[PDB]
Structures are given as structure tokens and as C-alpha cells.
Write a protein that binds this ligand. Structure first.
Ligand SMILES: [Zn+2]
Ligand SMILES: [Zn+2]
Length: 190
């Protein structure tokens, strides 16, 4: 059994990490949902604390799983059995990566909607285009500047939301890079 136990142990570890990854993604989605409802600033601050932690956790798992799975894929180059197990884990990883990308895309959309509503509350007569312009980088700056002629709270809220958005954009860019990385083949070398 010594020639096969090592490989199965690798597969088992990979699948354990996938379970952890899956759980991590769920926590992220769960925290996103609670954050969209939290009214207490004191409690909201800890939710973001947990969120940041889980996102870092997911980032760590992703890196490890990428290297472990591709490594497993190499072990099965000319071993039908090993190839199938590694591919199996690779397919599970791909699905979770996609689930995570969706979780973040969904939160991104909730974020933007809040941005638009904040402005409509200020400009209850604003048209779509005006609302769309108001949340753009240039549009927001123009509004802030134009104001420099209650904007503190508004600007602080905007900045906080903008920062959250950039974080999501960053993770999503990482997930896309990772997804593409996993889609790439693990090829023979001689
Ligand atoms: Zn043996
Ligand atoms: Zn905390």
C-alpha cells in the first residue's frame, strides 16, 4: 500500500481543505447578508472584522488548494486512477470558486444599489442617468466639490462604501485569475 497511500492522503487533505473553503465561502455570504441589515454601528464593526478574516482565510485556502490540486494532477499524468481523483477535486474547486465569485458579485450589486439610493434621497427628482453619474468616480467628486460652495456624513458614508467596493473588486479579480489558473492544463515534462 505504500505506493498509493501517499496519494490518497493528498486527495483526502485536498478534499478536507475544500470542505473548509466551502464553509468559508458560506460564512462570507452569511456575513454579507447580516451586514446589509445591521443598524448597530458597534455590532457592524465586528461583522466587518469577521468578514475580513474569512476573506483572508479564503485567500489562503485558494492558494494552497491551487498548488495541492495541480500537484495531485501531476501525480496522475499516466495513472488513470490518480488522474480521475485529482480531476474530481479540481472540478469541486472550480465550482466553489464560481460560488464565491457569485457571492461577491451579489454583494457588489447590493453595494451599488445602496449608493444609488443614498443619492436619490438627496436628489429625489434625479433621473437614472443623473443617479448613474452621481455614483461614478467623477460624478461623486463633482458633487463633493460643488458642495464646497451635512456633506461630511455623506462623504464619509460614500468613502466607506467605495472602500468596500474596491475590496470586492480585488477579491473578484483574484478569483477570476485563480479560476483561469485552475482551467490551465497540468502537462507532462520530459
Ligand atoms: Zn505498500
Ligand atoms: Zn471585532
Amino acid at each position: 500500500m505504500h505506493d498509493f497511500v501517499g496519494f490518497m492522503n493528498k486527495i483526502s487533505q485536498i478534499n478536507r481543505d475544500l470542505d473548509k473553503y466551502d464553509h468559508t465561502i458560506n460564512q462570507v455570504d452569511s456575513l454579507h447578508k447580516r451586514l446589509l441589515t445591521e443598524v448597530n454601528e458597534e455590532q457592524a464593526s465586528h461583522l466587518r472584522h469577521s468578514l475580513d478574516n474569512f476573506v483572508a482565510q479564503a485567500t489562503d485556502l485558494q492558494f494552497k488548494l491551487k498548488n495541492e490540486i495541480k500537484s495531485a494532477q501531476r501525480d496522475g499524468i499516466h495513472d488513470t486512477n490518480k488522474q480521475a481523483q485529482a480531476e474530481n477535486s479540481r472540478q469541486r474547486f472550480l465550482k466553489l470558486i464560481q460560488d464565491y465569485r457569485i457571492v461577491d458579485s451579489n454583494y457588489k450589486e447590493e453595494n451599488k444599489e445602496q449608493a444609488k439610493r443614498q443619492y436619490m434621497i438627496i436628489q429625489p427628482e434625479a433621473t437614472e442617468d443623473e443617479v448613474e453619474a452621481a455614483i461614478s468616480d467623477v460624478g461623486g467628486q463633482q458633487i463633493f466639490s460643488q458642495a464646497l460652495l451635512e456633506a461630511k456624513t455623506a462623504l464619509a458614508e460614500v468613502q466607506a462604501r467605495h472602500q468596500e467596493l474596491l475590496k470586492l473588486e480585488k477579491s473578484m479579480a483574484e478569483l477570476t485569475q485563480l479560476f483561469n489558473d485552475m482551467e490551465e492544463l497540468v502537462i507532462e515534462q520530459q
